[PDB]
C-alpha cells in the first residue's frame, strides 16, 4: 500500500508471489502445525529444483502449469487474516475515522475544552502552510519534462524542507480511532 507500483512484475516477483500463495493455501489445507511444516518443506524442495534453470523460455513454460495446479487445488475457502481485504473485520472501523478538517467546524464552546490540542493544531497548520509553498516549487523543479513516469515522490533535500505532499499521509486518522 505504501510503495508505488512498477509498470510490470518481473519473473522473480511472479515466482515469489506464487510461492507465498501456495504456502498460504497449503497451510490452510494442512490445519496442524507439524503437517504444515512437513508439507511446506516438501513444497520448498519441489519449488527449488528448477531454481538454476538458465533459459527464460522454459522458465516461462514453467510457472504456467504451476499456476494451473495451484488453481486446481486452491482450497476454495482459504484462511484470511481478520484485517485483510477478505477478513471478517476488514473495514470494521472505517465508520469511526473522522477526518481532521472536521475539527475546523467545531463550535467555540466545544473548542474551549482541549485548548492545548487546538494550540498544537494551529502550530501544525502554520507548518503545513509554509511547507506547501516550498513543496510545490520543489516538485515543479524536480519532475522531468512531459510529466512524471512513476508515482514515486522524492524526499526532502534541503534542511528546512519537508517531503512533498505529506499532510494527508501524516494526518491519517488512526488504525482504530475509537
Amino acid at each position: 500500500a505504501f510503495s508505488a507500483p512498477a509498470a510490470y512484475l518481473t519473473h522473480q516477483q511472479k515466482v515469489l508471489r506464487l510461492y507465498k500463495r501456495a504456502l498460504r493455501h497449503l497451510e490452510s489445507w494442512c490445519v496442524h502445525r507439524d503437517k504444515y511444516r512437513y508439507f511446506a518443506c516438501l513444497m520448498r524442495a519441489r519449488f527449488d529444483e528448477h531454481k538454476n534453470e538458465k533459459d527464460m523460455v522454459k522458465a516461462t513454460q514453467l510457472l504456467r502449469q504451476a499456476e494451473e495446479e495451484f488453481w486446481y487445488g486452491q482450497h476454495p475457502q482459504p484462511y484470511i487474516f481478520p484485517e485483510s481485504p477478505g477478513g471478517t473485520s476488514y473495514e470494521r472501523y472505517e465508520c469511526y475515522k473522522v477526518p481532521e478538517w472536521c475539527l475546523d467546524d467545531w463550535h467555540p464552546s466545544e473548542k474551549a475544552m482541549y485548548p492545548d490540542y487546538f494550540a498544537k493544531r494551529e502550530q501544525w497548520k502554520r507548518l503545513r502552510r509554509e511547507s506547501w509553498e516550498r513543496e510545490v516549487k520543489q516538485l515543479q523543479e524536480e519532475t522531468p519534462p512531459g510529466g512524471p513516469r512513476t508515482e514515486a515522490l522524492p524526499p526532502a533535500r534541503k534542511e528546512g524542507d519537508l517531503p512533498p505532499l505529506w499532510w494527508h499521509i501524516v494526518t491519517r486518522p488512526r488504525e482504530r480511532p475509537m
Binding site: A1, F2, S3, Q12, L16, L23, R24, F81, S84, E175
Partner: protein
Amino acid sequence: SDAPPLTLEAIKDRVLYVLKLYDKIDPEKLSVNSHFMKDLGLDSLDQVEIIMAMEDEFGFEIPDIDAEKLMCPQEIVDYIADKKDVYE
C-alpha cells in the same frame, strides 16, 4: 479487547525472537541492522519465509509489494510500527 499498547522495543524484541529461532542464521551474528541477502547470505525464498513467519506471529499480513522490499529487522520493525501507529 484489553490489548496492551505494544511499543517499539516490544516489537523489536518479538522480531529478534522470531529471527533467532530461524536456525538458518546464527543468533550471535545477527543484529538489528543486519541485512538478509548479503550480511546473512539468505535466499529470496528464505526472505519470503521470514516475512510469512512475522505475518503469522503478529496477526496481520503484509502486502507483497511492501514485503518484497524489507531486508533488515530494523525496517521490518519500522514498517510494523507504521502499520500499528506506535508512538514510542
